Design an enzyme around this catalytic site. Structure first.
Site, PDB file in Angstrom:
ATOM      1  N   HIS A   1       0.805  -1.218   0.000  1.00 54.57           N
ATOM      2  CA  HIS A   1       0.000   0.000   0.000  1.00 54.57           C
ATOM      3  C   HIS A   1       0.843   1.275   0.000  1.00 54.57           C
ATOM      4  O   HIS A   1       0.317   2.377  -0.168  1.00 54.57           O
ATOM      5  CB  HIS A   1      -0.960  -0.003   1.189  1.00 54.57           C
ATOM      6  CG  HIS A   1      -1.889  -1.176   1.207  1.00 54.57           C
ATOM      7  ND1 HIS A   1      -1.646  -2.309   1.953  1.00 54.57           N
ATOM      8  CD2 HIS A   1      -3.060  -1.395   0.563  1.00 54.57           C
ATOM      9  CE1 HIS A   1      -2.628  -3.173   1.773  1.00 54.57           C
ATOM     10  NE2 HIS A   1      -3.500  -2.644   0.934  1.00 54.57           N
TER      11      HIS A   1
ATOM     12  N   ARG B   1      -5.642  16.734  -1.073  1.00 56.45           N
ATOM     13  CA  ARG B   1      -5.402  17.642   0.045  1.00 56.45           C
ATOM     14  C   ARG B   1      -3.960  17.522   0.531  1.00 56.45           C
ATOM     15  O   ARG B   1      -3.357  18.501   0.974  1.00 56.45           O
ATOM     16  CB  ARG B   1      -6.360  17.350   1.200  1.00 56.45           C
ATOM     17  CG  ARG B   1      -7.802  17.751   0.945  1.00 56.45           C
ATOM     18  CD  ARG B   1      -7.979  19.259   0.959  1.00 56.45           C
ATOM     19  NE  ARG B   1      -9.379  19.629   1.147  1.00 56.45           N
ATOM     20  CZ  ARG B   1      -9.836  20.876   1.104  1.00 56.45           C
ATOM     21  NH1 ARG B   1      -9.004  21.881   0.873  1.00 56.45           N
ATOM     22  NH2 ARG B   1     -11.128  21.115   1.291  1.00 56.45           N
TER      23      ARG B   1
ATOM     24  N   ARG C   1     -13.577  27.527   2.932  1.00 58.75           N
ATOM     25  CA  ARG C   1     -13.159  26.134   2.887  1.00 58.75           C
ATOM     26  C   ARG C   1     -11.670  26.027   3.189  1.00 58.75           C
ATOM     27  O   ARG C   1     -11.276  25.668   4.298  1.00 58.75           O
ATOM     28  CB  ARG C   1     -13.454  25.539   1.509  1.00 58.75           C
ATOM     29  CG  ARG C   1     -12.973  24.110   1.314  1.00 58.75           C
ATOM     30  CD  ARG C   1     -12.933  23.752  -0.164  1.00 58.75           C
ATOM     31  NE  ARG C   1     -14.161  24.145  -0.852  1.00 58.75           N
ATOM     32  CZ  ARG C   1     -15.147  23.310  -1.163  1.00 58.75           C
ATOM     33  NH1 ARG C   1     -15.052  22.024  -0.854  1.00 58.75           N
ATOM     34  NH2 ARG C   1     -16.227  23.759  -1.789  1.00 58.75           N
TER      35      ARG C   1
END
Lengths: 237, 237, 237, 237, 237, 237
Positions: free
Chosen positions: E4, E24, E217
């Site tokens: 992973h 992000r 935001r």
């Protein structure tokens, strides 16, 4: 007539003895009841009504496992006006002192079933028998000169449990006999404002492997029946 | 022979059809099977062995409830070497588009029972039928020109549940039929390396409150029984 | 558009292949589909829509875990009109007979997640796939001459699990493959009225620690993709 | 001396009455016992030992809640040779018929605690009492002209429960009194092979809001005490 | 490396900030870190390593859900020598006095996942963060003119829960924010002997479905990032 | 007044120190508070109110176990308007590098109790303390030259637990101290909108099996108390 019983109000007495084996019901009727008559044969679940020492009594099989006996016990209570259910079943022993053919009376019945938690918001409902009925059976036993321990039974859903380590837990907490119905019936009685009790004859020992035959469970567990039948009379005073 | 089945190895075929009602088993033996001999009658749980179109098959009741049929199906496997088990029962309908007399095939089975959580370290075990048998059934039904929905059944412990909200839950998640055995039989098939299937006939509708008339009642079971048998011949090829 | 998918109704086909890895999805779009265009790139979860043999088809990653794939499948179904969802990924094996490189179709999905008990009033919900989709895939693989096992999968919440004793349980009850999404997708499918199916590739044995080589997992991953697409075609006809 | 009882073997009679309040143990010791001497003052949990009509008897508070009495009962049983434990505490009533100051004998004990599920592999342990002890109380009571119902108690972990709806459920299944110890004491009793019983005086009514004062609960629950001390005598014969 | 994460020891710093959204992470690396190099791109899970005011620091998405972020956190602690993990994401609000844009630090994290139960033998594991890290972020926010609420988060497995009532519950017991990872991450931290913290920014109110405009935001997202990075600095001292 | 506390609003300060031992409450009051007066004595659970360095402060026993302290703390809040509650007790260690006489502070508390599952729809509620309250303690400790550990406690129902492997799970997941109340007091503080904190001194190491001699056992209780009080003074600011 109910979805599982083809009888009418009055066909059953206000007290009903119930073994899991319908053929044992047939036995109890033929040898302990007087003028007994078949009042049900649906699903081969024989039910009989006769008299014992003058009193009107009924005996009906309830099948194996909690789900089975729960069906019959409720229908009788709500649709046949039954007040007292007395289960006369067979159980297995885990305690060394408990010998074959011993009669145990379960004032309380443990279980691995989930029925009672569903009734009791996933809490611990202590499934117990009617006290007066317990004392009745002990008194009846004393008069008949028959030994009978009072304590906890274990009502399991799996006769063939993948968890053998559980038997060690039962023995530690003094479980007298392992069966499959007691806790189920007790929950039903509580739910519908009826009264119940379980009396079992040790048919097999879990530790030593001592066993009774299927025929023996059917027609040779007399002590159980007369203790139960006599307790019915005592509970009429 | 066990305490619940009085027969010996070879007495049962490698495939057993099982209603909950023993009398249904007897009916099947006489109606569908040829040259049937009663191989068990302990506790009144009639079991017969005959031949359907030259194929050796057995039919026998398993009683009401997971605990009940768990015993019989387990023993039939370990003690009588049974490969396939095809339950043929009745179920309630919660879905409006699920009509009366409909034939539902349970590739999976939900349950409020705790037996599988016991087996499975308290995790979600998917009680599922053997795919091949599921497929064998779908095809046999199509050959007979009979619609057969495949999906989830629900195996309940309490035929009289205190939780009315739960039927709405069942309908929401598309439960085809409601009964009391599927999730258990599958659980046993998994534990003992056998194969199980459950076919049901919508005997009543919970929403509409419909019920089956004795005439068109035993005409539908005939179809379910035929499908169950024919499906075996398919899986034999 | 949803908080997790930057696209509008019409952008996705009515069927959607979903690998865990978005990069995989991009690979599927570019090598198995024609005129494939990107329909989502939010959070990196690549989604594509194109054609396979004239059939409109989408493919999009679903991320790792039940929580993740549940978000995407739900949105795909409620906001984008999707009807069928086919998850395709790798899985571990616990059964000795289940070999590396084997293809497993989860008609049922076990799990130690609590999402379904949350859905099904804390009872057992048999997270099952659509039968037709299961069968379609079986047939599609048979055409490509690939044997396929149909049975239970296990959807684990923890890839790195502290409960090593659990795998023995999975084996004892015939769990074919171990992954991390199946049960989550089936639960969503049931909750919102859609059809799902998970096909896996035995990429390693959890006990023997044996793995499949890079060349192998890619080869049989491609086979899985061909089975997935071909199966969608059968369902059409 | 045990970690909670500064005493030595012999300071406690083989039988011990235990209220939750140490001050009520002081009251008992001072008004019902002769030659009563304080045998424990640790944590203000007063214990005494004297005589009642020749019979040697001790009385000691166990504190509030299962965890508390679990400590003291266990220590007394495994380090002081106590054979019988009789809880004599307070309780609330949910049944309309059960009124203020009624005496209830708990042959069984429901609970929302987790201690018994921990002991019993997460299954339903029917936390019952010793039958003989139960019968001793019932018989002692009749001779004292004091009415006393025998049934289930409810051992709550939260005296202030956020689930008021649960009271309705308790009432439905005939719970006589609501307290905080019985189910726990019974678990300790069964686990360590001792015999126990709980008798309560309804100090407050849950629905009508009738209630007693602290002083009354401390010095006026006499029927309870009388019935207890007498039952001990009955059990010795 | 791992299946992973395509990297080796040294690639990641000992402190790893983690948003759920890889993009992000890419944003953070670009606008906050100096000389940033991508250290991972497996499954699109962008991970980077650079510096911040001299301090070596990594950043990398963790994906949606406990199962997902459990893989990345685990691997970071055992395979890459990571010692501190700071999750930085968005949460929903259930308390009326909790406002949008507000920063919440979870010293504790509730959840409806079973991962922790599995770890802690089915008991209540208080999924907590590292106190110092909690204190660091508090102090860091103070120096930035941001008041920060410290308390419990809730980690939901289902972003689309069918249990609407659970929100009333969360509100009742003072849940500040609602996300999908905190609990999972703390569990891993406790399992593999590391330290972790979650900082969230109330993005929307679960009651009124009010969302913070796209404007503030990243305005508050930047704040959240400054607080975290600066806290790491306070920690090094 | 309450059935457990014979006092009226105003008698208690807005902050209450609580030992399990009522004799300790008496000790603290007499040795740390000035102008101290007894405000409660019901059930022997001594309570006092006085002034520490001019600051008005109360101290009172909470008994043994969650169910016990749950009663007192709740009533202190709702009936006596208490803002803060600082439990001061002892605990056993399971971690090697945690030594005897150490001061541990539970910003969280694990538990094998079922109280929080009841409150929290059977999910995991992170039983956490009040952060600022935790910080006050940590800082006050640094001022007394004492280093204090902030982490998880384990609130246990059974002082005598049937499960020995549980201590290894506590050590594996980092539990600092083992006691019997923290998790309960934290649940109550959450439910009724108050703030609580548990400060513990290691009196037993379960691993090395050390215990505290009276000579040392009290100098450590003085330090823990000195901390809690000074902690309050900081809390006021």
């Amino acid at each position: 007539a109910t979805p599982h019983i083809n009888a009418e109000m009055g066909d059953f007495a206000d007290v009903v003895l119930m073994p899991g084996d319908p053929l044992r019901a047939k036995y109890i009727a033929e040898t302990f009841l007087e003028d007994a008559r078949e009042v049900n044969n649906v699903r081969g679940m024989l039910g009989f009504t006769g008299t014992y020492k003058g009193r009107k009594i009924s005996v009906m099989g309830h099948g194996m496992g909690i789900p089975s006996c729960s069906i019959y016990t409720k229908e009788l209570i709500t649709d046949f006006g039954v007040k007292k259910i007395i289960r006369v079943g067979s159980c297995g022993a885990v305690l060394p002192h408990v010998k074959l053919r011993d009669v145990v009376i379960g004032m309380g019945a443990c279980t691995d079933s989930k029925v009672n938690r569903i009734r009791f918001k996933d809490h611990d409902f202590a499934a117990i028998a009617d006290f007066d009925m317990v004392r009745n059976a002990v008194d009846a036993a004393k008069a008949l000169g028959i030994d009978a321990r009072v304590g906890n039974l274990f009502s399991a859903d799996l006769f063939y449990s993948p968890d053998g380590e559980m038997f060690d837990v039962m023995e530690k907490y003094g479980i007298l006999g392992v069966e499959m119905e007691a806790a189920g019936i007790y929950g039903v009685a509580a739910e519908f404002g009826a009264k119940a009790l379980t009396i079992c004859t040790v048919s097999d020992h879990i530790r030593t492997h001592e066993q009774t035959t299927a025929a023996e469970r059917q027609t040779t567990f007399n002590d159980m029946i007369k203790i139960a039948l006599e307790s019915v009379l005592l509970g009429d005073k």
